Amino acid sequence: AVTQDERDTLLGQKGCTVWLTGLSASGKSTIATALEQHLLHKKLHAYRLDGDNIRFGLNKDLGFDQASRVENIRRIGEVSLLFALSSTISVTAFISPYISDRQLARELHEKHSSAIPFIEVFIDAPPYEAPANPEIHIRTDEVDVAGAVEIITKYLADNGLIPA
Amino acid sequence: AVTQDERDTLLGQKGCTVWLTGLSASGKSTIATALEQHLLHKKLHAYRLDGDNIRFGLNKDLGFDQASRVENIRRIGEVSLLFALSSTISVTAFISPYISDRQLARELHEKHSSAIPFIEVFIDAPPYEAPANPEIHIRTDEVDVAGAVEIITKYLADNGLIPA
Secondary structure, eight states: OOOHHHHHHHHTOOOEEEEEEEOTTSSHHHHHHHHHHHHHHTTOOEEEEOHHHHHTTTTTTOOSSHHHHHHHHHHHHHHHHHHHHTTOEEEEOOOOOSHHHHHHHHHHHHTSTTOOOEEEEEEEOOOOOOOSSOSEEEETTTOOHHHHHHHHHHHHHHTTSSOO | OOOHHHHHHHHTOOOEEEEEESOTTSSHHHHHHHHHHHHHHTTOOEEEEOHHHHHTTTTTTOOSSHHHHHHHHHHHHHHHHHHHHTTOEEEEOOOOOSHHHHHHHHHHHHTSTTOOOEEEEEEEOOOOOOOSSOSEEEETTTOOHHHHHHHHHHHHHHTTSSOO
């Protein structure tokens, strides 16, 4: 069976999870869609996990209580990890207001034997909790959508996940 | 946002699910791993969903009763569909003895607006129920692992999912 490093070598990319966090109307969703499209323009495998393809397929059994809300983030975290194991750039902007929401998903990635990168991206715009040391901090008052896509893509290239 | 046909065009492949069914020791698992490796050798995105990466991450909450067993196949069917939506050749040989097990997952694919192909592959070797009209019928007494990989790979090419 194929090893993780051989899969990445054969496919020309390393998998990871890009988790866009921020206020509900900060534009994280718009950036998530643009980032995906740009990476596909580079012929890189990238896939957006959002409420449409997840909330009513895999997660149709989940309601809206605290328990359902946490289980939703747990499942998304695990599915995101599977995509990253397949060498895909998994991108999500799913609602997740608490630091402990993103921490649940981060641990799944860092504790895995593949040590998959979890790239938390703060889309910071003018009861959400902000991240303390996010991998990437994008201030919306200074950068447009295309500039946020460029910063994220450059991070991926700089850290060896996609070709330069 | 990117459409399904644009994603396939940009990435050079169409997504699908290859569902290998047959007796537990028919070699379906060995074939699933060899098929994945061969497709990665062609630089095609392919990913195996199996008991290791699924049963103790996404599905760790499931036990071993009938209900848990059906929910397991349901979730695997849905995750497989997401992989196919990402333009990945999703491969599974998961335990699924009943015709109604494979039917649950097939409907998820055929009822989707992307009409994702569901490729049921009968690995037929000397209480499992066999498929009636499977997409591919491979007899183990006539074909070795590499020929079964070749038969399956040619089906994908012949049906427009991978380049010839």
